[model samples]
Target chain A: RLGSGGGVCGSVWGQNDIAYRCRTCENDPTCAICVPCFQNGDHNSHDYSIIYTGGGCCDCGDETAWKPDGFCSNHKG
Target chain B: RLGSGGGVCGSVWGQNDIAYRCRTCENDPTCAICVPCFQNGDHNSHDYSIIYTGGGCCDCGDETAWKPDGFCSNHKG
Candidate 1:
């Protein structure tokens, strides 16, 4: 399953070691967001691994209220 | 069934009553972009609905050359 979090730097998913970067704001450093640009339906066919970068924190200081059970609540939207 | 397009405001998928927004660039309104921030596969279990918002154009007016058939030519990469 896909997990949600902040876009401080980037992320890698499962054991495949595929790294995906968080698309940050053009000029602002505090405004980082994550979008499922990569890993569309066709890319997640195997059991891979995931990793996050940038500030090393999820959600980039956003609220942690909407976090689901197995996922983190750092995502902005 | 995922179509690529520009991100002016946001979009809705299928008929599950779920709504998703486009993560636009901060400060610069013209630099709007579309990322698959929602409908990460699990959200497409049924034939729901889809809608685009903001500038009312797909791909945020980035380009009209990269669009594929069966979809609009506006989304930015």
Candidate 2:
């Protein structure tokens, strides 16, 4: 690990962020709802940082939150 | 352009890692030696963020830095 992962932007309100982790990134697990980051297909069906966030105000249940030609999983879309 | 850009790994000793910029990314500019990031042709000749770094120690003069299947522009390739 080069010590750097994602840097897109999705916002993390600390406890309010309610996001997932990218256990796939190895020692440096990035955010699943990769705050400030977006994977084209880097993380699919891979182990999560801490299971899943179930659902949260972070918009994981929103289709639009995870819809982009780049790559995302909205837990809805 | 999103608030986040690159996040790979490239040493930047403030004034040591001389590099170019991706001026075409709109408001935000990603690094040319896109530390922690790489473009697959999304930012080619679209205008540099701050002109070319010519041939800096950042490896802009090396062929490998700008020779990834992704996208790079090593000043020496």
Candidate 3:
């Protein structure tokens, strides 16, 4: 499950044609370009709640999730 | 029930109360100061699936939902 396998060049973005929102983070709500960035860092090591759009495979914890149609873009850049 | 019914001084921010993220909009996903802003306006009129954070009542349409513990703030302002 922690294969570091992902899409978005390495991100396991919207796995089910939906996106995942972080419960606690620096400041980037459900608006992200990628999820790998969060997984690759110490951003989430502890248990945190998340909001997500549904669709396909989802693995935001260990870089195990697969590719999705699109990522969550509920805001501007 | 659609009598502009709401909380938050007038907005049904979150009854059953989870913040519902808009699927389509100019910008701003599951982030907002209040849901009344969208329900009162033409923000969401058509059929649009949304991403939501769980909790209590969550009304993001037709001024239906009630006051929630907190609104979705997955990003910055």
Candidate 4:
């Protein structure tokens, strides 16, 4: 496993574990959820840095929000 | 219209049109489809700079491949 570590937000690298947390959000306590998506292969996902402003919120449970259609309708970018 | 112009790939920006192409990929006729996803709000989407590598293939029509679950199963990263 790549093992989730330090980064701008937060990281969690676990095998077969779909969920991840944001260190930045966790620090707030109230946030309870990290919004950033992992970029490296370690996270087991393709990066969408090419489009939009930020990745999907791992904890949000809304997959569509991360897509182009979702992002276009909801996010600023 | 952002217009499909020059970039690392290509750029096509139109209202409500969810598809974009890669100029770099288009330059090669064999590569009929452009793989990169647009990041800017004009493209209508969120950015995933925090994780993985490379955006989902807009032309491919496989949404799952872009997600954490999909990237891990298929793409290298």
Best by TM-score: 2
Pick the lDDT winner: 2
Residue A46 lDDT in candidate 3: 34
* Model 1, span B11-71: residue lDDT tens: 3122223232232221223222233433322223323234332221122322221122112
Model 2, TM vs. native? 0.23
lDDT of 3 by residue, B2-54 (tens): 11222223222222332334444323332332344434434345334443432
TM-score of candidate 1 relative to the true fold:
0.20
RMSD of 1: 15.1
lDDT of 2 by residue, B1-52 (tens): 1111132233332322334464443222323453433342345556654333
Over 4 Å off, model 3? A1-77, B1-15, B26-29, B32-35, B44-47, B50-52, B55-77
Candidate with more favorable, higher TM-score: 3 or 4: 3
Q: Which ten residues in a row have the lowest lDDT in candidate 1 chain A?
A: A61-70
lDDT of 1 by residue, A1-77 (tens): 01122332233222222232232211222222233423321223422234332221122222221112212243224
How far is A31's C-alpha from truth in model 2 (Å)?
5.0
- Summing lDDT over every window of 10 consecutive residues in candidate 3 chain A, give the lowest-scoring window: A68-77
lDDT, residue A9, model 3: 33
**What's the lDDT for residue A12 in model 1?**
20
